[PDB]
Symmetry: D3
Subunit: 157 residues, 6 copies
């Protein structure tokens, strides 16, 4: 059973590590898929985001980190994935997630969207909030893997 | 991995929305237990025996579904059934706040049990057993939302 | 087009929020039926006869409003009254999820009936008959939220 | 009775056609009003959006398609409209719609805002989602009128 | 300014979430009254006398908290206690719509009373007394969510 | 007892005046703190926003208007504030407010976030909506202090 966990991961946070770890306890192979997302004008290049996520997930044996610029559904078909994982923090996320999931089902009906809920510890964070705090020199060590925190410090230095 | 999943609910009665969710669950997990709550928080329209037989007939075509009644917490039932996945259906009209309370409480009770939210077809995204029962009790047409056996049992129940 | 609209509810009692909605509806549709549900999902404070008389007196100044009791589904009542519009009030504190369930169910029952959501004045956007009754039952001042006839009937009801 | 159905319609989708069709079954004359919306940096010019909507609604006798850069409320007064139609898909839309409707009521109290709910078929789509999928060469034929789908393909070609 | 604040609720039973909120309130206001509602909208598990004693023992370490029972509207109680601040806890799973209704109604009843929303620790953001009671009634472990005295009283209540 | 009411205030509205007035009835000293917020590309400079808010709050004796580009939590520590005030209009605001409040608690646990609800009169307005209406020459006199309305007219003239 192959699952894809797609996202912008700009950068990957402890909330993302929490979701992917839960995914590996459920499915045999997990593809952590980083979308290029140019419309979002990401802080880190796709190459950087892939490198950060690879290092941050090295301890999880059945995680493969890959980048993509393709349509989500086509990339999942090309990875032979039948499960699409997304983390759900609150009601605000739930509405937008439904649109993407119904569109993905329209484009690939055999690809099942599944939602997981992060730990209470990471239920109020996002890449956007972590970047906002770090842009103002606020301490975000608690929310990011060690290698990611270093890269975010270095990127803003 | 040989995953066992539970799909708990009152299923009073089981609807096409519940059939859609359990079918999706059988496509991703090796064994699915459709778990029917014995207890009435509010007194159910169908008895536990009626709810189980209706669900069995309606899922008989799905080879890896087992219909089982339970009277304990859904976390305690998952533990006793050696299930590590708890299926929750997430309709467009779900109480997302309650789902968050339930998932965090289930994780506290059984940390190794993972709550998995599945999405029904758009067709069943705006219905509930509660709404179906209200409509049927007030002489409205609900045939479209139910398996045929459930439609027949519901008409018989409302006739008497 | 000579449109007939229904505005259903329990109106237990009718409030200034309901008056605001029905007034807005009379400004856009030729005939508005303020439709009062006979049934108690939960037992109502005022009887159906009391709810109808209060609503009639409170809307007497609106020439194209008819107050009518009904005991069937709001879709079945709309069909029998040859109404093609169903008015729903949408306060800031409405259960939008339930409104979606209700609208899709009404469309399933009567496809030609269109659910129309109207917005009350900001003044009445945070009240409900339920909240008004709780406040009044616990000796709080609710005069501001009610038509004068309703205020008089509510004080008489709570006195005994 | 004259109703206005205003929006950016960048581009008009089957969800918009669903709403305007419902509006024509209720009101004698419906003005489908396309806002220029430069702040939103639209994909299609106002002239293109008007042309697409005109062709997409040609089968509906009592629909008039017009463009505007004016304040919403002033344009409705100038069209002699007393009804303002807006489609409501979910809770996320409902909150922003309330602000606009109360502002419109402040600017023109006789202009009644009315909300309609689209078919379940179009309850999870938006112009933004359709454009995102099409930018990644995903099939959106199901969600758009034929002429709109052609124009979106041609615009992205 | 010598501010007096009330923190009303049914506290049936008082949980670690309520302790967190009242502790935060004592850090910003000079005197906090933890106000326990006497009335059963729904019949409470613990009697008013039980709810008051449990809350007193659980807040005994906070010098500026007074635990008091009341049977009137929370606005009327705030007025009689000369309180100008009404504390509301805002968990991640709160009914924000109801909180808005309540705040606007309290402002109508007592304009000088300001509703203040406090946020609990993430640890208690997904629990409620209602959920705690359901879990405990169905033999689940709730020790983590309660003060020790409450855990002991709840086990005794469920044993009989 | 010292409270900070931070925000972009681009420009300050009657809804903001309502919140700060409520704050002064509760706390001895209130700091109305205007964040520079360059990421939001504000209409008014920080200097203009500070001047507008100073004039708009001159009648309130225990309000001090200050600008800042610092991390929120650091600025509150530096003002010796133990209370952080934020206005709550609806559910949509409530979710984002929770993230900021939990982040602020992580950065300064003694800084208590408190939420106040504005009057029904200002429950459906925002700086963004007022600017949108004014950009289209719509009347916004009802929603802004006199000096702010003049400045918004002059800025758009
Ligand atoms: O709400 C449903 O969808 C539901 C479905 C089936 C069963 C039940 C109830 C029935 C009695 C105990 C059951 C129960 N409540 C719980 C609360 C928290 C954690 C649990 O593990 C719970 N398990 C509820
Ligand atoms: O919930 C209200 O605002 C409401 C108002 C008036 C009446 C009613 C109930 C009263 C009994 C049957 C009525 C009824 N429920 C329905 C459910 C789905 C579709 C319908 O057509 C329904 N019509 C409810
Ligand atoms: O819902 C709570 O969290 C709650 C807590 C304590 C008490 C109460 C109820 C108990 C009886 C009257 C009380 C009451 N309802 C009111 C409605 C509007 C305005 C008020 O001032 C109210 N005060 C409710």
């Amino acid at each position: 059973k192959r699952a894809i966990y797609p996202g912008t991961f700009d950068p990957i946070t402890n909330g993302h590590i929490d979701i992917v770890t839960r995914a590996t306890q459920m499915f045999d192979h997990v593809i952590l898929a980083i979308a290029a997302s140019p419309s979002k004008k990401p802080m880190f290049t796709l190459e950087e985001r892939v490198a950060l996520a690879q290092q941050a997930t090295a301890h999880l044996g059945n995680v493969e980190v890959v980048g993509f610029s393709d349509l989500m559904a086509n990339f999942a078909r090309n990875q032979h994935a039948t499960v699409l994982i997304r983390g759900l923090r609150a009601v605000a996320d739930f509405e937008y997630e439904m649109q993407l999931a119904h569109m993905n089902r329209h484009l690939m009906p055999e690809l099942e969207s599944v939602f997981l809920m992060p730990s209470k510890e990471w239920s109020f964070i996002s890449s956007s909030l972590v970047k906002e705090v770090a842009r103002h020199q606020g301490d975000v060590t608690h929310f990011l893997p060690e290698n990611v925190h270093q890269a975010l410090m270095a990127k803003l230095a």
